[PDB]
Symmetry: C2
Subunit: 387 residues, 2 copies
């Protein structure tokens, strides 16, 4: 009864917690300056408990005098994975990010971002007078909203935590879906580029002020940054390195890469999106017959932006009970339903998915799974292979 | 490499599995008969592994000659919880269901369903000549899309599994959101009601054919059903009782009920939906200041139907890392941030949520949590109380 009031009330307070837990980047036009502004919070986990808030204010304005696209209000949704290179002796960060635009219901610069673009990042910083520099290199693939980079502190040890520098260290690699392409300021500014400025307030601590130039130099997208940090506490969360480096129990880069390859089999036109047409094609080639309504409801189920298609980050979320999943997978492979996957059936399944492999490569797949040497893959063999 | 091909391919097949895993009820108009049709599959878990498919074809036509609403294409999404009454010696089923309409983008009979409506269900069946009867009683609350019923076999032992009878045993209790109210055939037919007919094919087994009359008799919504089952196998999944009764590890009815009470504190107008206005009000009363964009993005995050508001089933899904959640909950209660929740602060938090309690009831809440007898609730006390 008292316990029921605590529960009731606690559920409500935890609900506001759960709802506020994953703040997106809120973008708005700035007509006056021919650009945009953005406002958002970042919650950095504190080692051993709690969150350090970082309140971001941002403005971007074009570098050139050309025309740009000035967007309606929308947001960007970001997923970030931080890691370490075990062979790297310098202070560093490996970063993987997926960013997609959303929040509007239902071509200048686009051509620069259709494939993989090399990226260079240079940062010179001063935090409480501690001078430092960072340089990073990698690739962006705006089709998947994907950025992959490795960063090095080129002045020795970073005097602030790596996670605090992530937002500072190329929003032109965000995936805007088709209906929102007219709201992509970032690409419209290219190749001449844009200036990005922010102030970032760390609750109960200091602030960063940054200015950056983001432009192409040849075929490379370059982000060159000046950062000044003031008013930080010597034993606070930033200067004290009390923030958690990476989120626990995320997927491996290698697992993500296998999911991307899997996504490819569906996205036959390579535009970074799975439509009902494409999902249907694959399902039908497998011997299944969804209706249009079933195909649509299937997509809706995982359609976070509500565009009617599955983009890669949405697919990754779904792929990120197990026994029953593996058993149903087995039936799809075992086309005639006799309890054995034959080399022929596997050949056919590969063709059905659009997976081009020689007959010898297929034989090697069976051989890897085929414990009892009958040249076929039974259910128990399939489970060992799948787990 | 062979392993990578298996993984790649397996991920794709499992993805079609995950996507197809929760089929909704697809509804379409039937202009000719002044009614609707529906098509959907039910996957029943087989004890010890696998799924028994049940392919449903449905048609409804009005009982009276009055006008009805003939809908555009849409669907219903259903969550079901089956349980047992430990005191009941008769063969029975306790059923809790939430049903909401979706799949259209962006008043006759409505007035009958604004509060809680008592329900009576009567079924007479013949399966492979085995005669049986079922009678059930409970309540529906269409505001939350909620049905709660208890069913008894009144002829002795049920010759088929309880889960196979769920779809047969009142879609007028579905929650249609505001923008879709003109597509609610089921309520528009009331009080005179409708006839519902289905054929249900159990893959590799027999079929059921049902006919039902659904209407008000006085203030009670009555579902009276005739079921005929033919062609079932004596040792198949149905006549053999080889289907799993209930899904494992669902919430208790008592937990759901505490979540509903929590939902109430937000839904101040009691219409079954939380708007950004209402979420804002509560958050602000707590000392928080979301912007409109933050409030909207918060809702979007859990908005499965894409209507812009949180209905109860959407809230339940969110409420259905823990340490960090409890720590952030503590800070909301501990308004001045001194490490102790005072009786005053708890009083204020109750008022902030719209939770009406006497000062004595609040004192009893502290007393229940207050292990060390200082009249306040510290963090460790709060964790013990919350877990
Ligand atoms: Ca595509
Ligand atoms: Ca989508
Ligand atoms: Ca086979
Ligand atoms: Ca074998
Ligand atoms: Ca409301
Ligand atoms: Ca909603
Ligand atoms: Ca306090
Ligand atoms: Ca105490």
């Amino acid at each position: 009864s008292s316990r029921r009031k605590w529960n009731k009330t606690g559920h409500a307070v935890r609900a506001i917690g759960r709802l506020s837990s994953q703040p997106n980047v809120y973008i708005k036009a700035d007509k006056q300056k021919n650009g945009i502004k953005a406002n958002f919070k970042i919650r950095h986990n504190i080692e051993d408990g709690g969150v350090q808030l970082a309140y971001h204010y941002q403005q971007n304005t074009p570098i050139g005098d050309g025309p740009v696209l000035l967007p309606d209000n929308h947001y960007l949704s970001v997923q970030s994975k931080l890691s370490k290179d075990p062979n790297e002796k310098r202070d560093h960060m490996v970063l993987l990010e997926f960013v997609t635009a959303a929040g509007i219901t239902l071509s200048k610069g686009e051509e620069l971002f259709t494939g993989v673009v090399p990226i260079l990042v240079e940062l010179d910083g001063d935090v409480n007078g501690h001078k430092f520099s960072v340089s990073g290199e990698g690739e962006g693939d705006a089709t998947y909203g994907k950025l992959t980079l490795k960063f090095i502190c080129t002045t020795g040890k970073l005097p602030v935590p790596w996670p605090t520098l992530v937002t500072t260290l190329v929003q032109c690699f965000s995936r805007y879906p088709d209906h929102m392409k007219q709201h992509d300021f970032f690409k419209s500014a290219m190749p001449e580029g844009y200036i990005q400025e922010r102030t970032i307030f760390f609750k109960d601590d200091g602030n960063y002020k940054t200015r950056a130039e983001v432009k192409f130099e040849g075929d490379t997208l370059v982000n060159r940054i000046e950062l000044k940090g003031i008013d930080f506490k010597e034993d606070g969360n930033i200067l004290g390195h009390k923030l958690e480096y990476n989120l626990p129990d995320q997927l491996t880069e290698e697992q993500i890469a296998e999911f991307k390859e899997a996504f490819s089999l569906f996205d036959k036109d390579g535009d970074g999106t799975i439509t009902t047409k494409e999902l249907g094609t694959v399902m039908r080639s497998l011997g299944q017959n969804p209706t249009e309504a079933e195909l649509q409801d299937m997509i809706n189920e995982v359609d976070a932006d509500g565009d009617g298609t599955i983009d890669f980050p949405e697919f990754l979320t779904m792929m990120a009970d197990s026994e029953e999943e593996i058993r149903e997978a087995f039936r799809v492979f075992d086309k005639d339903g006799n309890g054995y996957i034959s080399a022929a059936e596997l050949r056919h399944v590969m063709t059905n998915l659009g997976e081009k492999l020689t007959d010898e490569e297929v034989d090697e797949m069976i051989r890897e799974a085929d414990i009892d040497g009958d040249g076929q893959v039974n259910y128990e063999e399939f489970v060992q292979m799948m787990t």
